[PDB]
């Protein structure tokens, strides 16, 4: 039955990325912004290799990102959709049923502005999934998800439109 309780779409995780191009104080302030927003200590990502054009070097701490799950993820997601005034594009949804958008100023989310911190843009990505994804993540007896239970673009788009009364463009 397609109308089963356990087939319910719901958010798996929300990942917040700030890819400040340098290392040091600015990256530290981006990490402070992320720790403020999520309430969890974020983790800093190092450059996989050196590019002179981008001004980065291998193992230089470039970006910072954090993963939030549960009610806090829902609150942050709707806080970010308010900034987007609840209007994403069709191109924002991946073939695997995940979607993302990018804000440009972190004070638009609704947190206090500090001159020392400044403003950072931010990247939002939401990982969608039904119940039973633990099959693919547990240690013992890991398996794959059946085709009907898989998350795809159309189901995620319809679920987002229904649950948020928003519009999914396609320009």
């Amino acid at each position: 039955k397609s109308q089963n309780v356990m087939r319910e779409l719901r958010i798996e995780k929300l990942v917040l990325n700030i890819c400040v191009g340098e290392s040091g104080d600015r990256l530290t302030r981006a990490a402070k912004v992320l720790e403020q927003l999520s309430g969890q200590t974020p983790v800093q990502s190092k450059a996989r290799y050196t590019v002179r054009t981008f001004g980065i070097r291998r193992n230089e701490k470039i970006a910072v990102h954090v993963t939030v799950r549960g009610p806090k993820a829902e609150e942050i997601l709707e806080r970010g959709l308010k900034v987007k005034e609840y209007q994403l594009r069709s191109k924002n949804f991946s073939a695997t049923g995940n979607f993302g958008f990018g804000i440009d100023e972190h004070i638009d989310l609704g947190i206090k502005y500090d001159p020392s911190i400044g403003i950072y843009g931010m990247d939002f990505y939401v990982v969608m999934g039904r119940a039973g994804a633990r099959v693919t993540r547990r240690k013992r007896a890991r398996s794959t998800i059946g085709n009907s239970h898989k998350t795809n673009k159309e189901d995620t788009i319809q679920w987002f439109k229904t649950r948020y009364d928003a519009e999914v463009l396609d320009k």
Binding site: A31, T41, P42, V43, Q44, S45, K46, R48, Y49, T50, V51, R58, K61
Partner: peptide, 23 residues
Amino acid sequence: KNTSSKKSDAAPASADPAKAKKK
């Protein structure tokens, strides 16, 4: 604090293939 760990093995990379200009 905490930082991402190197899941990859490209120790002596320092650049990447496919990354070709004019492409």
